[PDB]
Amino acid sequence: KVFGRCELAAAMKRHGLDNYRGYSLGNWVCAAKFESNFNTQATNRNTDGSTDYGILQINSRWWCNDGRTPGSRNLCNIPCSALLSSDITASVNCAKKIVSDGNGMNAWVAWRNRCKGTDVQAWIRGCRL
């Protein structure tokens, strides 16, 4: 599913991501924009052999099981395929664990490089929320 910008903002808020660990909704929408362009089916293969999955490009090295990332963990206790669903519940619940892991949203390199320090409220501007 490719979400609309406001549609995704609303879904993230519904699932309790708004201001989670102090990160406003615009931060999460911005991260999703640059990780996946709002496409739940996004996948990307990393140089280390792990894969990133879903709207927030959650990585199989630590967070989910895909059966093909040697020496990896599955800390969210989910198949990586669950992160590709039109229903963002699994992605949101896993993101909550990731952002609580110590480095906040810096876990998402694209958030650090493209969202951090910017006017992230622009991402939810105009949205009925």
Using the rule CB under 5 A, which residue among 1, 6, 21, 24 binds Cl ion? 24
Contact between 113 and Cl ion per CB under 5 A: yes
Using the rule CB under 5 A, which residue among 69, 83, 88, 108 binds Cl ion? 69
Phi-psi region for residue 126, left (φ > 0), alpha (ψ -120 to 50) or beta?
left
- What residue ranges in the chain does DSSP mark as E strands? 43-45, 51-53, 58-59
Residue 4: both structure tokens together: 């609309």
35 is annotated as an active-site residue? yes
Contact between 121 and Cl ion per CB under 5 A: yes
- Rounded to the nearest whole angstrom, what is the least distance from the CB of residue 87 to Cl ion in the complex? 23
18 is in an annotated binding site: no
Torsion of CA 19, 33, 40, 23, to 10 degrees: -10
Residue from 7, 18, 35, 48 carrying the catalytic annotation: 35
Measured between alpha carbons, how far is 82 from 99 in angstroms, rounded to an integer? 19
DSSP element (H, E) containing 3:
none
- Rounded to the nearest whole angstrom, what is the least distance from the CB of residue 96 to Cl ion in the complex? 17
> Which residues contribute to the site for Cl ion (CB under 5 A)?
24, 26, 69, 72, 110, 113, 120-121
Task: Enumerate the active-site residues.
Answer: 35, 52
